[PDB]
């Protein structure tokens, strides 16, 4: 009685304790299994992002490098255009240098150009005046030429009359000296006649 | 009793031995589960630990990318505004080269013009030499032509005073011959008168 009931109390006691023990462990294994699930999925979520960020890095690292190449080329293009501009400034100074000396040759020539035209307007007035003087000297030459031709005809004819007058003074001298011959004879004839009157009127008283 | 007390004490021995092994299989199983989530926790921690190291380097490369982008934009702005200065200077240079190209045509046309002008003066002095050589000849001519007419004017004056006196001796000669023909009529009268005186005397002396 007191032996069997005291033992049955513990046999119900252990059957109950084992009921609670199997409860507790049926609970932890479910929780602990649920903890490995949360830790299993987070670990797998991190391996997803582990690659995801590693690839997004490489693109940046490349994106960076494409930029470092592109800057260094733009620096290059800018040093080519400024250097290209310094020559443009030189070229300009050289163009204006020749442009001003070109307008300094343009003055020398336009000035010698008027010196020529101002020397051709005297060369023409000196021509027209030397011709005018030389034209008047031939119109003087006829006027002085006829003057000699006129006085040449005068003495030319005046000499011919000189010859006719010497003709007339010769024929007159011949007639004069011839008739003095004739007067001289007739003068002897007159003194002869008066000799015949002297002999007749004289020997008349002597003959008878 | 004894028969039922041993079958129940056999139950006391049976379960106490079973919970002995159940407690042991319960500790070992939570031992392994805990040790599993430990491993899985040490893996997740070591990933997230690598993940923040990447995200750290990510931000750093993005910062370096953004620094290069900022600067390419300044590079770009400086380049395009320099181009605007060399394409302003270029169109400036094409005007300068055009004005010099025009001034070069004008200087060459004038250079041509002076050359024909200097040629006009070359011929103008050639004409002045051939036309002054003509005046000096015309003055030489009309010099000796005046000498000629003054000489011929002297001869006329002599010939003309000469003719006037050979006329005085022509008229004196003709007037002497006329008065000496008058003295002949007196000798011829006295001739016939002597004959009448003589014949009348003879004709008387032949009567008585």
UniProtKB/Swiss-Prot annotation, chain A:
<feature type="region of interest" description="Disordered">
    <location>
        <begin position="78"/>
        <end position="120"/>
    </location>
</feature>
<comment type="similarity">
    <text>Belongs to the rootletin family.</text>
</comment>
<comment type="function">
    <text>Major structural component of the ciliary rootlet, a cytoskeletal-like structure in ciliated cells which originates from the basal body at the proximal end of a cilium and extends proximally toward the cell nucleus. Furthermore, is required for the correct positioning of the cilium basal body relative to the cell nucleus, to allow for ciliogenesis. Contributes to centrosome cohesion before mitosis.</text>
</comment>
<comment type="subunit">
    <text>Homomer. Interacts with KLC3, NEK2 and the N-terminus of CEP250. Interacts with CEP44. Interacts with CCDC102B (via N-terminus).</text>
</comment>
<protein>
    <recommendedName>
        <fullName>Rootletin</fullName>
    </recommendedName>
</protein>
UniProtKB/Swiss-Prot annotation, chain B:
<comment type="subunit">
    <text>Homomer. Interacts with KLC3, NEK2 and the N-terminus of CEP250. Interacts with CEP44. Interacts with CCDC102B (via N-terminus).</text>
</comment>
<feature type="region of interest" description="Disordered">
    <location>
        <begin position="79"/>
        <end position="121"/>
    </location>
</feature>
<comment type="function">
    <text>Major structural component of the ciliary rootlet, a cytoskeletal-like structure in ciliated cells which originates from the basal body at the proximal end of a cilium and extends proximally toward the cell nucleus. Furthermore, is required for the correct positioning of the cilium basal body relative to the cell nucleus, to allow for ciliogenesis. Contributes to centrosome cohesion before mitosis.</text>
</comment>
<protein>
    <recommendedName>
        <fullName>Rootletin</fullName>
    </recommendedName>
</protein>
<comment type="similarity">
    <text>Belongs to the rootletin family.</text>
</comment>
